[PDB]
């Protein structure tokens, strides 16, 4: 994999 997309959740429940 060349471009790593790291995920982010906006609401912390």
The distance from CA 7 to its chain's CA centroid, rounded to whole angstroms, is: 1
Helix, strand, coil percent content, the chain, rounded in steps of 5: 0, 0, 100
The span from the CA of 13 to the CA of 5, in Å, is: 23
């Amino acid at each position: 994999q060349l471009y790593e997309n790291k995920p982010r959740r906006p609401y912390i429940l």
